Design an enzyme around this catalytic site. Sequence first.
Site, PDB file in Angstrom:
ATOM      1  N   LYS B  94     -10.833  -5.925  -3.087  1.00 59.13           N
ATOM      2  CA  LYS B  94     -10.549  -6.123  -1.665  1.00 59.13           C
ATOM      3  C   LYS B  94      -9.563  -7.253  -1.498  1.00 59.13           C
ATOM      4  CE  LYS B  94     -14.249  -6.990   0.535  1.00 59.13           C
ATOM      5  NZ  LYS B  94     -15.532  -7.135   1.277  1.00 59.13           N
ATOM      6  N   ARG B 101     -12.196 -15.658  -6.441  1.00 58.62           N
ATOM      7  CA  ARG B 101     -13.173 -15.880  -7.514  1.00 58.62           C
ATOM      8  C   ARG B 101     -12.744 -16.865  -8.608  1.00 58.62           C
ATOM      9  NH1 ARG B 101     -13.973  -9.313  -7.857  1.00 58.62           N
ATOM     10  NH2 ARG B 101     -15.016  -9.149  -5.828  1.00 58.62           N
ATOM     11  N   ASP B 166      -6.396   7.964  -3.169  1.00 54.40           N
ATOM     12  CA  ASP B 166      -6.801   7.212  -4.362  1.00 54.40           C
ATOM     13  C   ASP B 166      -5.931   7.585  -5.582  1.00 54.40           C
ATOM     14  OD1 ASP B 166      -8.842   5.871  -2.970  1.00 54.40           O
ATOM     15  OD2 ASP B 166     -10.457   7.078  -3.718  1.00 54.40           O
TER      16      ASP B 166
END
Lengths: 400, 400
Positions: B94, B101, B166
């Site tokens: 996302k 992170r 996708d």
Amino acid sequence: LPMPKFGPLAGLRVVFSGIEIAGPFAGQMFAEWGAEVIWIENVAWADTIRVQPNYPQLSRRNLHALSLNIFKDEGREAFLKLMETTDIFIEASKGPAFARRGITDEVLWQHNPKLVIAHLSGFGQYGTEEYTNLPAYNTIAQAFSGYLIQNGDVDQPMPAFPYTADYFSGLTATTAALAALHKVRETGKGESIDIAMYEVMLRMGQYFMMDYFNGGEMCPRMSKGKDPYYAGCGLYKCADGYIVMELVGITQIEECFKDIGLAHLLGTPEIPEGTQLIHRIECPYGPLVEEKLDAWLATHTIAEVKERFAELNIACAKVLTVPELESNPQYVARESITQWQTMDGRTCKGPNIMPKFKNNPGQIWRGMPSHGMDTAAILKNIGYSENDIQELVSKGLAKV
Amino acid sequence: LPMPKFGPLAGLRVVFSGIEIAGPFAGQMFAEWGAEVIWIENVAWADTIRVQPNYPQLSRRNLHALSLNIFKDEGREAFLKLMETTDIFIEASKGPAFARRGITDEVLWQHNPKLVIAHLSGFGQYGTEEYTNLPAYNTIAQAFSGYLIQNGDVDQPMPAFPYTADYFSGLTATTAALAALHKVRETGKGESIDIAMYEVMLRMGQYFMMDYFNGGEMCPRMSKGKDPYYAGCGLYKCADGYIVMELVGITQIEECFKDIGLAHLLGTPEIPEGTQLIHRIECPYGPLVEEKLDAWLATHTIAEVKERFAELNIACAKVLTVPELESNPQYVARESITQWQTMDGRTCKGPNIMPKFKNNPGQIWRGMPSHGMDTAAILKNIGYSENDIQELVSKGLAKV
């Protein structure tokens, strides 16, 4: 040829022969990313893409234009000379049409043993006599691959649009050619790539077809843009427009059901605790879920639904119409739609370069060229004199 | 790691982090064509693709499986060590989740300055606070790019299926990564690629959208699979099923019009002599043409239509259902659908490798691996001892 140095493909020399979408899309993508790309057109017949008033300004930007009979006498000689300094050649035609015309891979490799050759056709470079030499079209590739029969509504199949198979097929050729180019670095030997549009599309349509091949059933078609197997996923109608949603996750399902009047289904054997995705067929309450979802969504605006779904962490989006894109904040922030100058000094609007390379971004450096615009420069670059070029032109073998 | 040497990408090391279709499709395509590809999964749960009973046997073939927490403590240390001998790293998340992170591109490049990093997200790596960190889904990408609004019937939009966005987005990531890899071979400098799914799909939907951006109108949706702009092109109904056709060419139009009862339209302002392709928008008798074409097709069988259309050289095809593909002569001749063994020794059927590389063909050498199957071997290959691996396992940072 003169052009700015930019992008990951700076210095690469790509040539393509083909018209319309699939082959030229493959070749032009290299040009988006910094390559020197030469578009070959027939002397008597320009690429039919040029009939369209606006699309080609995008689909042929950053290109050099050569117009040459590559199959006849001096024209063939000039083409095979060009191959001597070409890294990748892409051609789209009806099966092994190049080999039938005397330009075999072997002949290409006599001129450049490192050449990466990509052949894009509807049915492949070999196979049966019935299919191999048939015309390439997007609709036919979708029909022949099982893609068409999976698109549309329960009782109305339809192709994916616009011309989806041409884009998949072209992109695949670019991908495959870049892969073969990598191998050339190590071995110094070229490659030939047989891209059959129906095989590209067969792969793209496997998510459920794999069940059919391995003992299961094929999925049905969507009903009004709802997923054929997963409840609460796909297209829905609100009071003032369409949305898509993806009802995925434990809390998402519990909170959504509370809203729509189905709290009582939670904890049942049919929708047990910890359910994160509802299968509409296997779950007896599938149709009821859709009835209540539809009813709830129909009384709320898109803005209201997006606000609640954000609170509930339910993935969703408004279905945007074309007029809503340019002013959309994400589009504006990322310059997703931009402007550039055509070769004749008019402003053209359309998508920016995608994707965004951080170190070596693409750029738009040239508008779509006219028929044979760069013929003289190209032929000079590979050793033809001014007189030689005038003679090619007078014979009908080149157009400048 | 142990594997056969084959394909254009033999010797290339690719690693991917992601689940479901887009990211894994991008990574696994390298494995089709000979690369060493490592699939990262979480420790205490697996990629949600594995819940599908058959597709993953295709979509995860030729892969090595690593189960490792790449963000935390010694798990992070092992991931960054792996990057030191990795050529390409693909991740779907996302927005700029890796940076949030603690794993910025700068951190990655500290371990390998050549690294090609492909970031696949719904809305890009930067932009507005509102959109950049939103969930990535196929339906959302179609909705947000103007693709969805162009698909479906006149009064019912729908997504292209199955999960078309996708596949386009994943394929684009593979392509762009191979382009950046070329630049690495030339300059030694790695790259970070920001692939936003909506920008991918924006580009695939431009054929008519370019008219809207540049003064003209947007095209309508198809009517029952018929092209919105070109008469006699698309899906039609015969007596005993569906076909697609492309009414293109001078004599094609003339002789078809005579067959269907419209000979009196030929040589007119509305259908001028020499017309190759009828633009429905602008031809006042477009609806009449569709009426007469439908009536004629409805009284003939698919075989009768193919016979006549072969005489007239009008391109066409039957819309194949999935049960019709395996026995089709072109599929048989080209081995388009093949069989291989799963890792637990069952026979699996599905598409062969595509496209077909002549000199260095791809092959199926391994079934889909189990969760953490290759963790021990991978960690050993980059310098971890048996004890070091056991400690990662006890700490919940790896699974074997």
